[PDB]
Amino acid sequence: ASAAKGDHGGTGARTWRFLTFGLALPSVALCTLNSWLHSGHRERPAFIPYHHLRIRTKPFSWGDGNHTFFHNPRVNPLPTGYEK
Amino acid sequence: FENRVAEKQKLFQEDNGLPVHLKGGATDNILYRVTMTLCLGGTLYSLYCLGWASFPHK
Amino acid sequence: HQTHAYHMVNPSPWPLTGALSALLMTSGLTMWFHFNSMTLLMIGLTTNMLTMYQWWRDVIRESTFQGHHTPAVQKGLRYGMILFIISEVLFFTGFFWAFYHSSLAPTPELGGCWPPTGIHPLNPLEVPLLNTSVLLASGVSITWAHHSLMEGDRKHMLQALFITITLGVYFTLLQASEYYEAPFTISDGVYGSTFFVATGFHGLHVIIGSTFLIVCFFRQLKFHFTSNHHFGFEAAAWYWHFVDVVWLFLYVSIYWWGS
Amino acid sequence: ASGGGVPTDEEQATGLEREVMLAARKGQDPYNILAPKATSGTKEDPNLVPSITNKRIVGCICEEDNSTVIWFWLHKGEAQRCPSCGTHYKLVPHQLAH
Amino acid sequence: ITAKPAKTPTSPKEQAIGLSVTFLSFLLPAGWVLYHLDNYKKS
Amino acid sequence: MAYPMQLGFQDATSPIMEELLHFHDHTLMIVFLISSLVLYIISLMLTTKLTHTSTMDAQEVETIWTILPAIILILIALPSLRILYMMDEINNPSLTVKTMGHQWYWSYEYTDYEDLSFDSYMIPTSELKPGELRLLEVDNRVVLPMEMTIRMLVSSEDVLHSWAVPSLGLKTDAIPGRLNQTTLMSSRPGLYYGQCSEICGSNHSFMPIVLELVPLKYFEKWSASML
Amino acid sequence: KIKNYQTAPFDSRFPNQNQTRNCWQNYLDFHRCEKAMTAKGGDVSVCEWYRRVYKSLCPISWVSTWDDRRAEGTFPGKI
Amino acid sequence: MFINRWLFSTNHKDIGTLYLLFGAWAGMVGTALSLLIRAELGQPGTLLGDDQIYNVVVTAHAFVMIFFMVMPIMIGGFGNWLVPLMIGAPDMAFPRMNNMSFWLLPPSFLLLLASSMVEAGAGTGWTVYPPLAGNLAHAGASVDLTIFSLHLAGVSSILGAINFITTIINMKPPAMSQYQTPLFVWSVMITAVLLLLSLPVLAAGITMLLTDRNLNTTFFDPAGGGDPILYQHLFWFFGHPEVYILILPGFGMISHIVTYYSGKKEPFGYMGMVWAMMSIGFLGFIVWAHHMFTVGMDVDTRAYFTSATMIIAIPTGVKVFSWLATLHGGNIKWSPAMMWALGFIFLFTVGGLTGIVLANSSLDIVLHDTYYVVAHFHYVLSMGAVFAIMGGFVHWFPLFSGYTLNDTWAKIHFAIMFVGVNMTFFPQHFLGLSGMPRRYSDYPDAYTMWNTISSMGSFISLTAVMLMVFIIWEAFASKREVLTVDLTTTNLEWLNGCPPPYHTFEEPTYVNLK
Amino acid sequence: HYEEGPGKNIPFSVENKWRLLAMMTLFFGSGFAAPFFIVRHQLLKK
Ligand SMILES: CCCCCCCCCCCCCCCCCC(=O)OCC(COC(=O)CCCCCCCCCCCCCCCCC)OC(=O)CCCCCCCCCCCCCCCCC
Ligand code: HEA
Ligand code: HEA
Ligand SMILES: CCCCC/C=C\C/C=C\C/C=C\C/C=C\CCCC(=O)O[C@H](COC(=O)CCCCCCCCCCCCCCCCC)COP(=O)(O)OCCN
Ligand SMILES: CCCCC/C=C\C/C=C\C/C=C\C/C=C\CCCC(=O)O[C@H](COC(=O)CCCCCCCCCCCCCCCCC)COP(=O)(O)OCCN
Ligand SMILES: CCCCC/C=C/C/C=C\CCCCCCCC(=O)O[C@H](COC(=O)CCCCCCCCCCCCCCC)COP(=O)(O)OCC[N+](C)(C)C
Ligand SMILES: CCCCCC/C=C\CCCCCCCCCC(=O)O[C@H](COC(=O)CCCCCCCCCCCCCCC)COP(=O)(O)OC[C@@H](O)CO
Ligand SMILES: CCCCCC/C=C\CCCCCCCCCC(=O)O[C@H](COC(=O)CCCCCCCCCCCCCCC)COP(=O)(O)OC[C@@H](O)CO
Ligand SMILES: CCCCCC/C=C\CCCCCCCCCC(=O)O[C@H](COC(=O)CCCCCCCCCCCCCCC)COP(=O)(O)OC[C@@H](O)CO
Ligand SMILES: CCCCCCCCCCOC1OC(CO)[C@@H](O[C@H]2OC(CO)[C@@H](O)[C@H](O)[C@@H]2O)[C@@H](O)[C@H]1O
Ligand SMILES: CCCCCCCCCCOC1O[C@H](CO)[C@@H](O[C@H]2O[C@@H](CO)[C@@H](O)[C@H](O)[C@@H]2O)[C@@H](O)[C@H]1O
Ligand SMILES: C[C@H](CCC(=O)O)[C@H]1CC[C@H]2[C@@H]3[C@H](O)C[C@@H]4C[C@H](O)CC[C@]4(C)[C@H]3C[C@H](O)[C@]12C
Ligand SMILES: C[C@H](CCC(=O)O)[C@H]1CC[C@H]2[C@@H]3[C@H](O)C[C@@H]4C[C@H](O)CC[C@]4(C)[C@H]3C[C@H](O)[C@]12C
Ligand SMILES: *N(C(=O)NC1CCCCC1)C1CCCCC1
Ligand code: CUA
Ligand SMILES: [Cu+2]
Ligand SMILES: [Mg+2]
Ligand code: NA
Ligand SMILES: [Zn+2]
């Protein structure tokens, strides 16, 4: 490909700055717009004690040894089901 | 800010026979002794931990 | 006197302290994992930080201050960095191999399907796409920083490098948020396993790359870099691209194709 | 869109890096970064081997594309010949650092 | 290769001593452990 | 089983193992030839006062010692691959038996019709009956019909194990969560031995496999009574 | 009826040494079939083949485990 | 001054020395471990206990011989000592990082000793396969300490590889092309590239095992949808290249020893030797599954791996025949070193050839996990690798120390070891064909004779090891200082005297470009 | 700067052949003995 733009006669500092502010950052702003729009907590799914999930072959070296490191009560059930 | 590299160049090229890790002054000495103490101490501590775990506590 | 351009390094204690810090951390993790104690691990991490700081400090002293980095010494450092990145790539290779092995032939325990039964994948068009535009954008800004530095523009080099770092931090925060919002955990089978371990390690590389960039930032402020000699910056930038590229693969494989 | 403030090598290079740079500028090579071009190697036109002492190890690649290199100490004095191809080498002692 | 005469010659007697000491340093400790192997197995 | 002072392979009990004995003989000859050729050449180079220390040209003899070995390899690969594919041939078995490896014994399941299954443990040295083989006897043998194509499925319920029977040329790893297949066909009636072939802990050396090959008829009665 | 089964015949879909899927597939197929028939008012006897096959190939413990899970509601497979 | 020199070193020679000392000590540990194995197998019955303690010994024997003896000696020892001297370099590119490669080893070795001290040790085999290595069949710290030991050993090697490759590419005389560097230098670089590419995969794999054992991941656990066979692939992808990593530097030394004692100024077919090491190194990355012929793979896959594995015999053949062509027409000096090199050429070929037997998946079904494999690898390692180390050791000892060894004693040592190793491993081919499995503390009665002879052979080897320690003492005790060495015109490492000064090549060599 | 030449480029002393014999005997003897004692250690735990 060749993109859809042009320059190339001499790729220098001004050109890359132009790309930072004119392409790169605006793209980040659009994806920031889209993301903080499609967010919103999705209704947590019903708990089913599936044997291939919530694995516990050895307790974690922290807490009560049953909570994952970034455990989120709202969405991460314990092997026995969601928390109170 | 101002460019003070020249000063630092002078200090580090100063012929005092000091190895680069201590050529910056007394602080280097301190940091070194702290580092070395932690390493040697922790290592000793680690040997103790090994000795402890080597035997059954039934 | 020497009539060659190579660097004869002053006897240093850093290799030993680093070696010992390695022993303290591995020993430390074992102590943590089995004898419920973090003391050793704590000391290990500390001596390690101390070692790295002093070791690289000396490297800056030997180069910027002592002039030991002749074109030949610098040429060697380029090779060293390229070889280092290569081994880091191969390390990831093992993880991508694990991912593809598990995802292409889902076992009966997963319900013979991918993603496994009971796993609800994040949407690749949401935070993952954002994360992607963030890293790609930092790639553009770091390139502007490089050209600014080569063109002798101090202000704009600092400006661009700062933007790059912010983006790296932004990515790191977004990813930590995602880890917390994720309905699945590392304990959720081979899917959780491959996901967090791969993106986990990549997350760590991003943190390291960022730190490297920050070091360059401060060395820039202190005028360490000349418009023609700034290998520390070049290495940090190569490392940054490496990190960016690994993300693209994670994105395409785990987040997009793997959902 | 542009400005300055970043040092140059000419303004900031120090130590050996600086010497190599200055030497290179004069068209010299005190730090052996370049490979010396050979003379005819005859008794009359020997290869001049710079040195800072009274002897220097010489490596002779007798014929182009040879994989074996002939090594020997070239001493101060009468020209010596490669034990393999017989080309001549003569040591031309000291200086470098004024 | 050419070399100078031994600066501190090791007589045949001396060599018997080094050899014997060397062999024993390997053989003794091991032999002791191996000897008491039954005293270890059940104790 | 192996006999005292055995040098080669245990006698072939299946057509495939026979095939392998012949292939191994073929291979071993080449190995012997090449190794003795090399030892000979070494002694030839070291037994003459004549010398030639000047530069020797290589782009000529390298052709010889590149093409020759290449040919020799093809001479080994052909019959090797013929036998490999032969082992993969579709055969359509008359019976299917499963074996699960456990720490430290094997369990067997003949579930084609009835739900027959049993554990197979090594007979302790102290409880061996006179004439019985130390470390090799098991309480319950794997009774199977002779001269019939049997499908053996292997797996494990804990760590890895490997189900092997040398006289038949068999060795299939017992991996938990996996079902490995192999075909068994004994040309003769008898007792055929094997041992766990994958490190599995404390008693890896003590969990043998003993097959009892009998005529179809006896196999049937045996099935019935093992209910 | 069209039976007289000895053992599970070679299945061209699973021609290699790894038969894990062969057992799995047949176990699935049987319980899927048994479901639709017990559903639409039909005879489960048509599902007989798959039961024989998975019976032959599947280790007792796998079948047992799978059966226990279908009952518990935690069977990962789609039936 | 002592600490500055031996603990804060930045000198390639001193670092190489430290490596030699470490490897020598490690070799004693591995020998002790090997003797314990043969003692247990010396007579039917149980000597130490069940398979657990026995396999903790078998596992340790392997890690120690491989990671602490062979690699430190060949790569860290001979590599650091000779590479700079052979290209006329003042030192290595990253002299400080080099020092760290060394200091990571004692810690790494410590973790290994720890692992065997705590709990019931790690009786897993050096391959450390799950589930046996998992937190259920091997609960406790043992296996975790073993993984950590490998991690440290791995970083040490990766750091060393980065240093060697950079030094060899960037620090040769300006006029010297890569096609003008000695074969040992080539061997070291190729080994380094193999390390750089393979160890990271190993690291990935043992990390996944660590997390399965400690963070509830299920990479190799079917319950979570994992696969024990995934581990085997990751392990062996590193494991095969590793065996080539263990032999390549040996190939390099053999080329130098054979050329030297043949009174030749160069090895036969230099470019053919370079091509051969590169091909071997490459092929070594695409043949790993030959260690998994019984796990149950598709027939096509097994046919590919049989073929790819056999091809390696071609480049290896070129090397063997070239060493013979180097001996051809030479004024042979029957030195102890030459003897080790000749034994190497023969014994290695044997082990390589039986390696070719095993490459046939068909036959491997029956030979896999039997003593035939143990016989194959001990010929190439305990005879190949080890003989290259011994030959290199006696040849260069005078260079490193400044003293000469007693030649007659060295010849006696060679003879004892030769008998020992052959008596130990030859009969194992028999035990293999007849079905004796690997990793067994006891065996059926029929295997008694060969196991008895093998163990006797191992004691002979022990006598040889003890003798060598004495011989090294006698050299240092008598102090016969070196005067002159022959063939220096084609052996640059000797040109600075014995031992060379702390700093060599302060003034680089002179090399015309013409 | 450091000592150079035979017997000086090493971390142990070779001044006295007997003191040296002792060093070497401890050095290699310790390495060789280690496995035996660890085995004893393991048998003495249970
Ligand atoms: C130590 C115990 C020995 C027991 C011996 C046999 C007793 C037989 C009774 C009675 C004998 C007759 C009745 C039984 C016949 C059985 C035939 C069989 O089933 O057949 C298969 C069997 C038996 O094979 C044989 O048919 C035995 C072959 C023996 C070759 C020996 C070379 C020995 C050299 C030096 C002595 C050994 C140590 C050094 C070995 C050094 C490496 C070879 O199993 C093998 O395949 C074993 C070998 C595996 C491959 C090694 C390959 C390269 C080896 C040597 C090349 C040397 C070349 C130069 C020539 C040799 C130069 C040195
Ligand atoms: C380099 C590798 C190496 C070496 C040299 C050896 C050497 C020996 N090995 Fe082994 N061995 C392995 C690597 C090695 N081994 C591996 C990887 C395994 C498999 C592990 C597993 O199954 O998991 C194994 C397995 C193994 C088994 C099979 C265990 C089983 O399946 O139950 C046996 C059995 O007899 C054995 C015996 C021996 C013996 C008696 C020696 C003797 O020949 C040793 C004699 C002494 C030496 C060769 C040491 C000499 C070197 C030095 C001491 C350096 C000296 C100092 C200087 C020069 C400076 N080894
Ligand atoms: C120094 C170490 C070393 C080296 C270089 C090799 C080299 C080779 N190895 Fe081996 N190997 C090991 C160490 C080594 N190996 C170890 C440690 C194991 C077991 C690991 C474990 O499970 O613990 C092992 C296991 C092993 C296996 C697995 C067996 C099993 O577990 O069932 C196989 C399979 O193919 C094999 C093959 C080969 C081959 C084909 C070579 C080839 O590279 C050899 C090529 C050499 C020659 C062929 C000889 C010289 C050539 C000629 C004279 C030319 C003419 C030849 C012909 C025409 C054939 N090796
Ligand atoms: C913010 C993004 C960046 C990620 C990293 C940041 C913080 C975590 C701390 C260290 C991580 C460094 C590397 C990755 C190692 C393990 C995977 C971690 C990735 C991670 O952080 O995964 C988390 C799991 O945490 C866990 O167990 C983690 C448990 C933490 C202990 C670390 C375990 C130490 C093991 C390291 C092995 C070292 C070997 C490496 C050797 C390299 C070569 C020699 C995910 O959280 P969760 O609740 O399960 O699911 C989310 C549900 N809401
Ligand atoms: C599905 C899997 C998922 C995982 C995927 C994850 C990530 C993707 C992978 C990669 C992307 C990452 C980063 C890319 C960005 C920058 C890298 C830096 C490159 C750079 O910018 O390189 C420059 C030039 O090219 C040079 O080096 C050229 C010289 C190179 C020298 C070093 C190489 C030496 C090593 C061995 C040599 C190999 C030999 C080849 C022949 C073998 C035949 C088989 C710097 O100069 P220098 O060293 O002085 O050389 C002088 C030659 N001009
Ligand atoms: C699977 C196993 C494979 C089996 C291997 C088979 C081995 C090959 C067997 C024979 C090879 C034949 C090569 C013939 C070359 C002639 C030898 C000769 O004589 O060597 C030189 C040729 O140079 C040259 O090729 C250089 C010198 C000779 C070059 C070749 C010598 C090496 C041959 C191999 C050495 C033995 C190792 C064999 C390995 C198995 C001599 O030079 P000229 O006469 O011009 O000058 C002398 C002056 N005049 C003119 C007055 C006489
Ligand atoms: C690379 C260029 C050279 C080209 C040669 C080709 C070699 C490798 C690339 C091919 C990879 C894709 C092939 C997948 C297609 C088959 C799908 C499949 O299903 O394969 C799967 C595994 O593939 C997997 O993970 C595959 C995982 C990858 C393994 C390959 C290892 C090499 C990686 C290291 C290279 C470093 C590169 C640096 C990166 C820039 C599972 O195995 P099966 O046996 O089917 O089990 C199913 C049974 O139930 C029935 O028998
Ligand atoms: C929470 C955060 C903590 C996490 C742990 C890791 C922390 C930080 C890692 C970030 C790496 C910082 C590295 C800074 C390096 C500074 C030294 C430097 O950049 O040194 C430069 C050389 O390159 C060189 O050595 C290049 C040196 C390359 C090193 C980069 C490699 C990354 C290493 C990661 C190691 C992690 C280990 C963890 C162990 C458990 C100096 O040469 P120039 O720049 O040309 O200067 C000369 C001019 O002034 C002349 O005019
Ligand atoms: C379970 C936990 C396992 C933990 C294992 C940890 C092992 C070690 C931890 C401590 C190591 C950190 C301390 C700093 C190391 C810096 C090496 C460095 O920066 O070395 C440089 C060379 O490599 C270059 O450039 C290019 C390459 C730079 C490589 C940087 C070092 C990274 C270490 C990799 C280990 C990562 C471990 C994995 C962690 C996730 C500089 O070369 P020197 O010889 O110094 O000097 C030469 C002079 O001319 C400089 O003026
Ligand atoms: C695999 C490597 C090992 C190879 C085999 C070792 C070779 C022989 C070593 C001899 O060593 C010893 O001999 C003893 C017996 O001869 C012991 O003494 C013991 O036995 C006695 C006499 O029977 C007593 O007098 C003492 O109390 C005693 O403990 C014992 O201490 C030991 O040092
Ligand atoms: C190779 C590169 C990487 C090297 C290894 C990586 C090192 C990772 C360190 C992890 O350490 C931690 O461990 C903990 C456990 O000890 C935590 O505390 C916690 O754990 C507890 C102790 O049981 C609780 O009291 C608390 O709630 C708390 O979350 C914790 O925050 C975190 O810092
Ligand atoms: C061309 C190249 C280097 C020659 C040089 O520039 O000196 C040489 C070195 C080794 C040679 C190879 C090795 O000798 C091995 C092979 C020998 C066969 O005679 C031809 C192909 C063969 C694969 C050779 C092809 C080519 O002549 C190679 C690759
Ligand atoms: C063994 C490995 C898969 C490892 C894993 O299961 O994770 C697989 C992936 C791709 C396979 C390769 C590719 O599918 C291409 C080739 C296909 C042929 O039928 C066999 C050899 C062949 C060269 C394969 C060998 C082997 O089975 C490979 C390399
Ligand atoms: N990886 C590596 O050094 N890259 C990163 C890893 C995270 C911490 C900073 C460096 C290694 C490559 C070789 C194998 C082990 C990982
Ligand atoms: Cu079961 Cu070994
Ligand atoms: Cu291999
Ligand atoms: Mg196996
Ligand atoms: Na025994
Ligand atoms: Zn010449």
mmCIF file of C-alpha atoms in Angstrom, chain H residues 299-414:
data_model
loop_
_atom_site.group_PDB
_atom_site.id
_atom_site.type_symbol
_atom_site.label_atom_id
_atom_site.label_comp_id
_atom_site.label_asym_id
_atom_site.label_seq_id
_atom_site.Cartn_x
_atom_site.Cartn_y
_atom_site.Cartn_z
ATOM 1 C CA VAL H 299 2.104 -40.888 10.699
ATOM 2 C CA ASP H 300 3.003 -38.116 8.210
ATOM 3 C CA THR H 301 4.446 -36.024 11.005
ATOM 4 C CA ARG H 302 6.524 -38.971 12.202
ATOM 5 C CA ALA H 303 7.731 -39.616 8.643
ATOM 6 C CA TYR H 304 8.848 -35.987 8.324
ATOM 7 C CA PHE H 305 10.762 -36.045 11.623
ATOM 8 C CA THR H 306 12.515 -39.287 10.756
ATOM 9 C CA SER H 307 13.738 -37.784 7.495
ATOM 10 C CA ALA H 308 14.722 -34.355 8.758
ATOM 11 C CA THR H 309 16.615 -35.975 11.618
ATOM 12 C CA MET H 310 18.638 -38.281 9.368
ATOM 13 C CA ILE H 311 19.799 -35.470 7.078
ATOM 14 C CA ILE H 312 22.012 -34.135 9.876
ATOM 15 C CA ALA H 313 24.328 -37.087 9.201
ATOM 16 C CA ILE H 314 25.445 -35.472 5.907
ATOM 17 C CA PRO H 315 27.000 -32.277 7.306
ATOM 18 C CA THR H 316 28.264 -34.255 10.328
ATOM 19 C CA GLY H 317 29.854 -36.696 7.909
ATOM 20 C CA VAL H 318 31.734 -33.906 6.134
ATOM 21 C CA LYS H 319 33.267 -32.914 9.461
ATOM 22 C CA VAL H 320 34.312 -36.448 10.396
ATOM 23 C CA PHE H 321 35.936 -37.111 7.074
ATOM 24 C CA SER H 322 37.629 -33.688 7.143
ATOM 25 C CA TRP H 323 39.312 -34.426 10.459
ATOM 26 C CA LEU H 324 40.578 -37.623 8.917
ATOM 27 C CA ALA H 325 41.784 -35.663 5.886
ATOM 28 C CA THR H 326 43.532 -33.303 8.296
ATOM 29 C CA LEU H 327 45.406 -36.270 9.829
ATOM 30 C CA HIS H 328 46.243 -37.404 6.284
ATOM 31 C CA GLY H 329 49.897 -36.824 5.470
ATOM 32 C CA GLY H 330 50.659 -35.200 8.787
ATOM 33 C CA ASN H 331 53.697 -35.676 10.982
ATOM 34 C CA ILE H 332 51.581 -37.090 13.818
ATOM 35 C CA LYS H 333 52.517 -36.130 17.366
ATOM 36 C CA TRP H 334 51.134 -38.797 19.681
ATOM 37 C CA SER H 335 50.355 -36.398 22.465
ATOM 38 C CA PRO H 336 47.701 -37.035 25.171
ATOM 39 C CA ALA H 337 45.504 -34.372 23.488
ATOM 40 C CA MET H 338 45.774 -36.073 20.126
ATOM 41 C CA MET H 339 44.741 -39.294 21.835
ATOM 42 C CA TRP H 340 41.584 -37.739 23.256
ATOM 43 C CA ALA H 341 40.845 -36.271 19.797
ATOM 44 C CA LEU H 342 41.263 -39.589 18.055
ATOM 45 C CA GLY H 343 39.071 -41.377 20.630
ATOM 46 C CA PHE H 344 36.566 -38.594 20.067
ATOM 47 C CA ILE H 345 36.450 -39.036 16.289
ATOM 48 C CA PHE H 346 35.709 -42.766 16.767
ATOM 49 C CA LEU H 347 33.436 -42.812 19.827
ATOM 50 C CA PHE H 348 31.380 -39.856 18.580
ATOM 51 C CA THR H 349 30.765 -41.534 15.223
ATOM 52 C CA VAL H 350 29.428 -44.613 17.046
ATOM 53 C CA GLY H 351 27.072 -42.501 19.183
ATOM 54 C CA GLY H 352 26.030 -40.531 16.161
ATOM 55 C CA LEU H 353 25.304 -43.666 14.196
ATOM 56 C CA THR H 354 23.126 -45.120 16.964
ATOM 57 C CA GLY H 355 21.463 -41.698 16.992
ATOM 58 C CA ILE H 356 20.616 -42.394 13.326
ATOM 59 C CA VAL H 357 19.126 -45.784 14.348
ATOM 60 C CA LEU H 358 16.846 -43.988 16.808
ATOM 61 C CA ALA H 359 15.777 -41.452 14.151
ATOM 62 C CA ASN H 360 13.622 -44.175 12.604
ATOM 63 C CA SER H 361 10.199 -43.749 14.268
ATOM 64 C CA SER H 362 9.370 -47.366 13.439
ATOM 65 C CA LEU H 363 12.288 -48.735 15.381
ATOM 66 C CA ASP H 364 12.072 -46.005 17.987
ATOM 67 C CA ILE H 365 8.754 -47.389 19.221
ATOM 68 C CA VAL H 366 10.714 -50.282 20.631
ATOM 69 C CA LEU H 367 13.892 -48.393 21.543
ATOM 70 C CA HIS H 368 12.307 -45.317 23.079
ATOM 71 C CA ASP H 369 12.664 -44.944 26.874
ATOM 72 C CA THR H 370 15.083 -47.902 27.000
ATOM 73 C CA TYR H 371 18.769 -48.061 27.694
ATOM 74 C CA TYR H 372 19.541 -47.961 23.953
ATOM 75 C CA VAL H 373 18.906 -44.216 24.138
ATOM 76 C CA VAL H 374 21.081 -43.951 27.252
ATOM 77 C CA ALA H 375 23.846 -45.715 25.288
ATOM 78 C CA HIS H 376 23.419 -43.342 22.344
ATOM 79 C CA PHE H 377 23.719 -40.173 24.333
ATOM 80 C CA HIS H 378 26.523 -41.309 26.601
ATOM 81 C CA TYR H 379 28.702 -42.140 23.637
ATOM 82 C CA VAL H 380 28.206 -38.624 22.247
ATOM 83 C CA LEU H 381 28.344 -36.916 25.654
ATOM 84 C CA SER H 382 30.378 -39.049 28.025
ATOM 85 C CA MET H 383 32.762 -39.905 25.222
ATOM 86 C CA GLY H 384 32.206 -37.205 22.643
ATOM 87 C CA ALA H 385 31.675 -34.032 24.691
ATOM 88 C CA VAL H 386 33.859 -35.196 27.561
ATOM 89 C CA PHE H 387 36.717 -36.311 25.303
ATOM 90 C CA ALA H 388 36.694 -32.924 23.542
ATOM 91 C CA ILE H 389 36.878 -31.200 26.952
ATOM 92 C CA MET H 390 39.749 -33.423 28.139
ATOM 93 C CA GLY H 391 41.692 -32.997 24.894
ATOM 94 C CA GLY H 392 41.192 -29.265 24.992
ATOM 95 C CA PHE H 393 42.117 -29.204 28.661
ATOM 96 C CA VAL H 394 45.469 -30.977 28.329
ATOM 97 C CA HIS H 395 46.291 -29.138 25.109
ATOM 98 C CA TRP H 396 45.709 -25.640 26.538
ATOM 99 C CA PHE H 397 46.552 -26.167 30.202
ATOM 100 C CA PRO H 398 50.140 -24.902 29.597
ATOM 101 C CA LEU H 399 48.668 -21.801 27.968
ATOM 102 C CA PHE H 400 46.381 -21.086 30.868
ATOM 103 C CA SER H 401 48.759 -21.948 33.656
ATOM 104 C CA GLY H 402 52.274 -21.433 32.265
ATOM 105 C CA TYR H 403 53.096 -24.989 33.443
ATOM 106 C CA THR H 404 53.310 -28.299 31.643
ATOM 107 C CA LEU H 405 51.677 -31.562 32.627
ATOM 108 C CA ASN H 406 53.491 -34.862 32.896
ATOM 109 C CA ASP H 407 52.686 -36.403 29.450
ATOM 110 C CA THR H 408 53.028 -40.010 30.558
ATOM 111 C CA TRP H 409 50.554 -39.534 33.414
ATOM 112 C CA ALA H 410 48.114 -37.916 30.973
ATOM 113 C CA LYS H 411 48.436 -40.913 28.630
ATOM 114 C CA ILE H 412 47.724 -43.294 31.507
ATOM 115 C CA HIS H 413 44.632 -41.235 32.431
ATOM 116 C CA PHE H 414 43.390 -41.399 28.841
#
